[PDB]
Enzyme design. Structure first.
Site, PDB file in Angstrom:
ATOM      1  N   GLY A 184       0.723  -1.352  -0.018  1.00 33.69           N
ATOM      2  CA  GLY A 184       0.182   0.059   0.209  1.00 33.69           C
ATOM      3  C   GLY A 184       0.727   1.422   0.214  1.00 33.69           C
ATOM      4  O   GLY A 184       1.999   1.411  -0.158  1.00 33.69           O
ATOM      5  N   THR A 185      -0.151   2.273  -0.292  1.00 39.16           N
ATOM      6  CA  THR A 185       0.731   3.660  -0.155  1.00 39.16           C
ATOM      7  C   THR A 185       1.479   4.002   1.154  1.00 39.16           C
ATOM      8  O   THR A 185       1.145   3.585   2.272  1.00 39.16           O
ATOM      9  CB  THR A 185      -0.763   4.779  -0.339  1.00 39.16           C
ATOM     10  OG1 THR A 185      -0.938   5.061  -1.687  1.00 39.16           O
ATOM     11  CG2 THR A 185      -0.095   6.279   0.662  1.00 39.16           C
ATOM     12  N   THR A 186       2.228   4.883   1.323  1.00 41.21           N
ATOM     13  CA  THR A 186       2.856   5.134   2.423  1.00 41.21           C
ATOM     14  C   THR A 186       2.303   6.298   3.353  1.00 41.21           C
ATOM     15  O   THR A 186       1.688   7.258   2.642  1.00 41.21           O
ATOM     16  CB  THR A 186       4.608   5.841   2.119  1.00 41.21           C
ATOM     17  OG1 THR A 186       5.147   6.094   3.261  1.00 41.21           O
ATOM     18  CG2 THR A 186       4.503   6.627   1.113  1.00 41.21           C
ATOM     19  N   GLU A 221       0.376   9.580   1.376  1.00 43.45           N
ATOM     20  CA  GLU A 221       0.541   9.736   0.201  1.00 43.45           C
ATOM     21  C   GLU A 221      -0.687   9.313  -0.692  1.00 43.45           C
ATOM     22  O   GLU A 221      -1.130   8.395  -0.552  1.00 43.45           O
ATOM     23  CB  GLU A 221       1.701   8.780  -0.316  1.00 43.45           C
ATOM     24  CG  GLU A 221       2.144   8.807  -1.855  1.00 43.45           C
ATOM     25  CD  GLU A 221       2.880   7.478  -2.262  1.00 43.45           C
ATOM     26  OE1 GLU A 221       3.596   7.541  -3.338  1.00 43.45           O
ATOM     27  OE2 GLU A 221       3.424   6.874  -1.270  1.00 43.45           O
TER      28      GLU A 221
END
Lengths: 140, 233
Positions: A30-32, A47
């Site tokens: 996943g996104t950070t 993010e």
């Protein structure tokens, strides 16, 4: 033998729960997102990948609030994150209704903690596919 | 089914050209005992609505908790919570009315009479009543309990119908309300001298006045009254 990784609450020969470890993979994919504790508060940031020009900017909010003093952000399966925050909100409302004071961060942390842990106890449910960063300010 | 124990008396209100005014004294009665004096019965919700409650105080405090939750809940996953998607006076009223009617329908009412005062987002004044039976109605002036009998007659001399609203100023309206509070203090045995008053203006916003007192009372003529018929001294 094998197959220890096919059912959620099973202990593998080395004492691990492979389904929980696979859930972690969904999180790493996943996104950070992050959280920074400052001298009198906390900051959360995430993010948001722009899949295309079509996404209306500033409209798909990911950070969520619980009660009025807590922030929560997560990486992984977004729907699982929302599910967790919904529970967090019921948990916070319940605490305030009985004790009047808004829920302390440590208390809130364990509430989410016990619920998430509960989903590693049975094979009838799947573990949460998210890692969550949350916090806020309280009495101390 | 129940019976009220600690109670709040009248709640009065009216609308003027730019908004609405609502007031209620600060007493919590226990039968004939004037038990509590620091009771605030006007509940502000956001900056466009004020909810005035009479009747059972324990139920009032419950309604208070319900309102604070509506605010919290409305802010969830709502990036426009302090703008286009903020709670409107009409949303708050419909909610309470719904609750009031469900509770009476289960034979377990919230023993109150409520008046929701506020200004909508488009400037429209909002004034509506709801009580323990779930009964609702709107009028240029609204009052509960005793105020219904003694305040509406005085407030209606100022705004007798809809067309009188635009011709009425904040000054005239507040003056009328304050006089009504004095009259209620004269003839209502469950009233207090101290009260709160709130104004919701589409321009000046929300003005909440605490610790007001009935002033300019006439009592002097009492010295001349003696006996109950034939006594002369």
């Amino acid at each position: 033998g094998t197959g220890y990784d096919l059912s959620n609450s099973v202990f593998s020969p080395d004492g691990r729960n492979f389904q929980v470890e696979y859930a972690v993979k969904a999180v790493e994919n996943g996104t950070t997102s992050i959280g920074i504790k400052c001298n009198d508060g906390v900051v959360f940031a995430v993010e948001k990948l722009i899949t295309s020009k079509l996404l209306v900017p500033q409209k798909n909010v990911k950070i969520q609030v619980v009660d009025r003093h807590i922030g929560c952000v997560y990486s992984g399966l977004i729907p699982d994150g929302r599910h967790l925050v919904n529970r967090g909100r019921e948990e916070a409302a319940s605490f305030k209704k009985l004790y009047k004071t808004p829920i302390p961060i440590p208390a809130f942390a364990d509430r989410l903690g016990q619920y998430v842990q509960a989903h590693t106890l049975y094979n009838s449910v799947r573990p949460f596919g998210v890692s969550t960063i949350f916090g806020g300010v309280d009495k101390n | 089914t129940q019976q009220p124990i600690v109670t709040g008396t009248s709640v009065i209100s009216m609308k003027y050209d730019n908004g609405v005014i609502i007031a209620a004294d600060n007493l919590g009665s226990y039968g004939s005992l004037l038990r509590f004096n620091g009771v605030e019965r006007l509940i502000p919700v956001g900056d466009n609505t004020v909810v005035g409650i009479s009747g059972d105080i324990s139920d009032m405090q419950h309604i208070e908790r319900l309102l604070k939750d509506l605010v919290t809940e409305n802010a969830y996953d709502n990036p426009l919570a302090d703008a286009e998607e903020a709670l409107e006076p009409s949303y708050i009223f419909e909610y309470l009315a719904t609750v009031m009617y469900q509770r009476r329908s289960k034979m377990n009412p919230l023993w109150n009479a409520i008046i929701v005062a506020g200004v909508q987002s488009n400037g429209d004044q909002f004034l509506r009543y709801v009580n323990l039976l779930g009964v609702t109605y709107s009028s240029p002036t609204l009052a509960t309990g005793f105020g219904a009998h003694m305040a509406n007659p005085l407030l209606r001399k100022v705004v007798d119908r809809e067309s009188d609203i635009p011709k009425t100023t904040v000054q005239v309206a507040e003056e009328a309300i304050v006089n009504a509070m004095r009259v209620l203090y004269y003839r209502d045995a469950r009233s207090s001298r101290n009260f709160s008053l709130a104004i919701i203006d589409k321009n000046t916003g929300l003005t909440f006045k605490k610790n007001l007192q009935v002033e300019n009372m006439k009592w002097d003529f009492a010295k001349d009254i003696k006996g109950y018929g034939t006594q002369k001294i």
